[PDB]
Design a protein around this ligand. Structure first.
Ligand SMILES: O=C(CN1C(=O)CSc2ccccc21)NC1(C(=O)O)CCCCC1
Ligand SMILES: [Br-]
Ligand SMILES: [Br-]
Ligand SMILES: [Br-]
Ligand SMILES: [Br-]
Ligand SMILES: [Br-]
Ligand SMILES: [Zn+2]
Length: 855
């Protein structure tokens, strides 16, 4: 019989109410079986039930009316569906139960119901089984109506050996002994939720717990050897859940919240309702070895996953085209919450960096609107990108500054209350925010890609403003909430620009004007006539006349304008010279973010002399700030992050005072047999210098197997990827790909670091090409992991030959990668790199030879 349904989306006329899932995993044979019972009703007469199933071996399917009838099973593996045919049509509105018996193999990927492993201190391999369903992998563990708008309650039962613990979304009601060495755990019924949020883990994890003031038991789960690193996340999770409950005025509805650190995990974390899961590096904190960056990362990742309990779980997007309703909000709420719960982290100052990263992809033709259509699993996975997360958060921040925090908060509380246990579209959010023209304005920011360039022309008191789509002509127009300050006023002045152009009149003439105050708006600014000269003069003479975020926005925008010929490279580089006086993390890092990519392009070309001169200029520019750093872990989180990055930068570029100190610390660390406690903040620099020799690299690698510290593992991995030894770089690719000595969850990062190694970069792009099929099988087409490997190995090329290697390779893949959005993005980036280098290389050579810092 041919397949009776020819659409990717399921029919809307058969709706589930409740699922009873029985799962029995065998961790010795790596197999599982299940029985899924789903209560359904049909809104129209049908004899066919279409549902999702992927890589499950279905043995039997029956239909119970409320008698039992057998169902004929048909499969459509490409659509990832099964069709269950009943002997007679279902009666409308009457309850039926579909019962499906099946078996599967535990996935060897990081999705579905997959295998995870770890080693004990004695070298014994331990196996656990965990889940990762978002977006479409629930259908790999149980047959279901696997679309987020088909919400249902779930009663989960897990069969296991007595040596294992099982945890799931809800608390454990009871454990029944079925037979010898066979226990069945019954978990309480969940509230109405999407299939992608179902979770279960079978392991020998240990836990620590703490109860919130609202009575919620919060626990952190981890392997026995790492449960002593769970205290920080446990305390942070309790404080953040209490923050969100008080903030939203909507209690967390479940009796418990678990945070599990999984030894193998693809993304950073996942918000499964009641059972949030994390990479061990995103949750576990070692008070002696963890970095300030990693502590910030745990805090923000926990805040993100807990925000999703409201934004994503309680209220879910109707379809993946509106995935930003979940991810943009969760990303933005990390800042809203942590700014209050952990004020010592000063996160609010760092938000804007995400917006500049989103602008890098959003300035290309291959970007997409925040809300855009998706059909198949690879396209849906492509929605987990910088546009949904970072542009999503940045436009919400822009809107909050525009409406005020009070009006914005009222709109989001109304929205969550109105749509609790249901699904929403982009329009529902805008109607909630307008109930406090929001919809017209925010449609310009979510229903078309990109962002505007705002051009300012000052004629005495007359300030002319123009908008145009910034693209590296569509005729796009936005409702832009402009802000500005002047040399006469530091009040934030506002002007809503809804037309191509407008003009305003200043009360008095000014010496300078600066738009996008604190860079809270998702747009860039160009100043005509002497505007850039006036702003450059202000930064050179009195840089604290504007805030550190305003200084960072001027640096970023000046370099973005060079790409479209609005500002010469010489004038942008002249502006950057003020950084010799800068002390603040955001503008110092913004200077690095703009300048470092220039020598990354030179490293992949025969441009050694200008590359070396450019690197010497960068070190000279920040020399006073580098020399002021102590080689300790002293200071605030920003002082520590600034120290670590500056010392690492100085050492990799052979700045002699720092290389000598790093060389001495590494030699002493190796002499001590790795017992010397180095300051965590200098460890990246010390290890990167030490790995340059064969003996140093082998010694660093010998310590890797014993480490229980996520930071130490990450620091060693970074250092090992910096060697000039090509056999060692190849070995890291081969071993992390294999997953024994270095876990495969680190492969995408290792591949990108080697792709950025000045001598070993050809090896990363070659490895990706030669192992494409296995990498796609492990990480999936459309995944953020694949996108980071594609862009990480190719987006710093700047020759027509490299451009054609990329086009030729990906077009030869046909259905296994030729249509990837990351491929078009990297092709467009290489085209821009070719043009930028051709135009600016010798201009930079001449500018460097002028030695303006030495003048
Ligand atoms: O360049 C990189 C990585 N990287 C890029 O590949 C270009 S975008 C970028 C912007 C800011 C910071 C790092 C960036 N890392 C270092 C390098 O020269 O390879 C320099 C910094 C010390 C670590 C090594
Ligand atoms: Br049974
Ligand atoms: Br505003
Ligand atoms: Br005038
Ligand atoms: Br010191
Ligand atoms: Br090849
Ligand atoms: Zn998220």
């Amino acid at each position: 019989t041919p397949f009776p349904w020819n659409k990717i989306r399921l029919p809307e006329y058969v709706i589930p109410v409740h699922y009873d899932l029985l799962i029995h995993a065998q961790l010795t044979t790596l197999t599982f079986w299940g029985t899924t019972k789903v209560e359904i009703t049909a809104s129209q007469p049908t004899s066919t039930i279409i549902l999702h199933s992927h890589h499950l071996q279905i043995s039997r399917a029956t239909l119970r009316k409320g008698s039992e009838e057998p169902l004929q099973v048909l499969e459509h593996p490409r659509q990832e569906q099964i069709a269950l045919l009943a002997p007679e049509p279902l009666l409308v509105g009457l309850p039926y139960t579909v019962v499906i018996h099946y078996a599967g193999q535990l996935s060897e990927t990081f999705h579905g119901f997959y295998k995870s492993t770890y080693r004990t201190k004695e070298g014994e391999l331990r196996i656990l089984a965990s889940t990762q369903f978002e977006p479409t992998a629930a259908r790999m563990a149980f047959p279901c109506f696997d679309e987020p708008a088909f919400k249902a309650s779930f009663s989960i039962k897990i069969r296991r050996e007595p040596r294992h613990l099982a945890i799931s979304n809800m608390p454990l009601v009871k454990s029944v002994t079925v037979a010898e060495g066979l226990i069945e755990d019954h978990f309480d019924v969940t509230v109405k939720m999407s299939t992608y949020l179902v979770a279960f883990i079978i392991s020998d994890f240990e836990s620590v717990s703490k109860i919130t003031k609202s009575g919620v038991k919060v626990s952190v789960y981890a392997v026995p050897d790492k449960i002593n690193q769970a205290d920080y996340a446990l305390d942070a999770a309790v404080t953040l859940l209490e923050f969100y409950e008080d903030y939203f005025s909507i209690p967390y509805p479940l009796p418990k919240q678990d945070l599990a650190a999984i030894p193998d995990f693809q993304s950073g974390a996942m918000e499964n309702w009641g059972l949030t899961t994390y990479r061990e590096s995103a949750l576990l904190f070692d008070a002696e070895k963890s970095s300030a960056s990693s502590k910030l990362g745990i805090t923000m990742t926990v805040a993100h996953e807990l925000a999703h309990q409201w934004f994503g779980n309680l209220v879910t997007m109707e379809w993946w085209n509106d995935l930003w309703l979940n991810e943009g909000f969760a990303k933005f709420m990390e800042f809203v919450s942590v700014s209050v719960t952990h004020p010592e982290l000063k996160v609010g100052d760092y938000f804007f960096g995400k917006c500049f990263d989103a602008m890098e992809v959003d300035a290309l033709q291959s970007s997409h609107p925040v809300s855009t259509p998706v059909e198949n699993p690879a396209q849906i996975r492509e929605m987990f990108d910088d546009v949904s997360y970072d542009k999503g958060a940045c436009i919400l921040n822009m809107l909050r500054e525009y409406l005020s925090a009070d009006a914005f908060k009222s709109g989001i509380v109304q929205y969550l209350q109105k749509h609790s246990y249901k699904n929403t579209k982009n329009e529902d959010l805008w109607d909630s925010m307008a109930s406090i023209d929001v919809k017209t304005m925010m449609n310009t920011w979510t229903l078309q890609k990109g962002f505007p360039l705002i051009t300012i022309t000052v004629r005495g008191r007359n300030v002319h403003m123009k908008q145009e789509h910034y693209m590296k002509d569509t005729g796009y127009l936005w409702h832009v909430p402009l802000t500005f300050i002047t040399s006469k006023s530091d009040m934030v002045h506002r002007f809503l620009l809804k037309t191509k152009t407008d003009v305003l009149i200043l009360p008095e003439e000014v010496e300078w004007i600066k738009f996008n105050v604190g860079m809270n708006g998702y747009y860039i600014v160009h100043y005509e006539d002497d505007g850039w000269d006036s702003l450059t003069g202000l930064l050179k003479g009195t840089h604290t006349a504007v805030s550190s975020n305003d200084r960072a926005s001027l640096i970023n925008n000046a370099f973005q304008l060079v790409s479209i010929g609005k500002l010469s490279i010489e004038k942008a580089l002249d502006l950057s010279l003020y950084l010799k006086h800068e002390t603040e993390i955001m503008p110092v890092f913004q200077g690095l973010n703009e300048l470092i990519p220039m020598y990354k392009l030179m490293e992949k070309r025969d441009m050694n002399e200008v590359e070396t001169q450019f690197k010497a200029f960068l070190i000279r520019l920040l020399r006073d700030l580098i020399d002021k750093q102590t080689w300790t872990d002293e200071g605030s989180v920003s002082e520590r992050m600034l120290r670590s990055q500056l010392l690492l930068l100085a050492c990799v570029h052979n700045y002699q005072p720092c290389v000598q100190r790093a060389e001495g610390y590494f030699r002493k660390w190796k002499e001590s047999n790795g017992q010397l406690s180095l300051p965590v903040d200098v460890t990246l620099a010390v290890f990167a210098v030490g790995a340059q020799s064969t003996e140093g690299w082998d010694f660093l690698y010998s310590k890797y197997q014993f480490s229980l510290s996520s930071t130490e593992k990450s620091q060693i991995e970074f250092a090992l990827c910096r060697t000039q030894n090509k056999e060692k770089l190849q070995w890291l690719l081969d071993e992390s790909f294999k997953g024994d000595k270095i876990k495969t969850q680190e492969f995408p990062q290792i591949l990108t670091l080697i792709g950025r190694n000045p001598v070993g970069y050809p090896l990363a792009w070659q490895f990706l090409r030669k192992n494409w099929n296995k990498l796609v099988q492990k990480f999936e087409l459309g995944s953020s992991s694949i996108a980071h490997m594609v862009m990480g190995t190719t987006n710093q090329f700047s020759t027509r030959t490299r451009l054609e290697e990329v086009k030729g390779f990906f077009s030869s893949l046909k259905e296994n990668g030729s249509q990837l959005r990351c491929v078009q993005q990297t092709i467009e980036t290489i085209e821009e790199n070719i043009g930028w280098m051709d135009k600016n290389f010798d201009k930079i050579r001449v500018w460097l030879q002028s030695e303006k810092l030495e003048r």
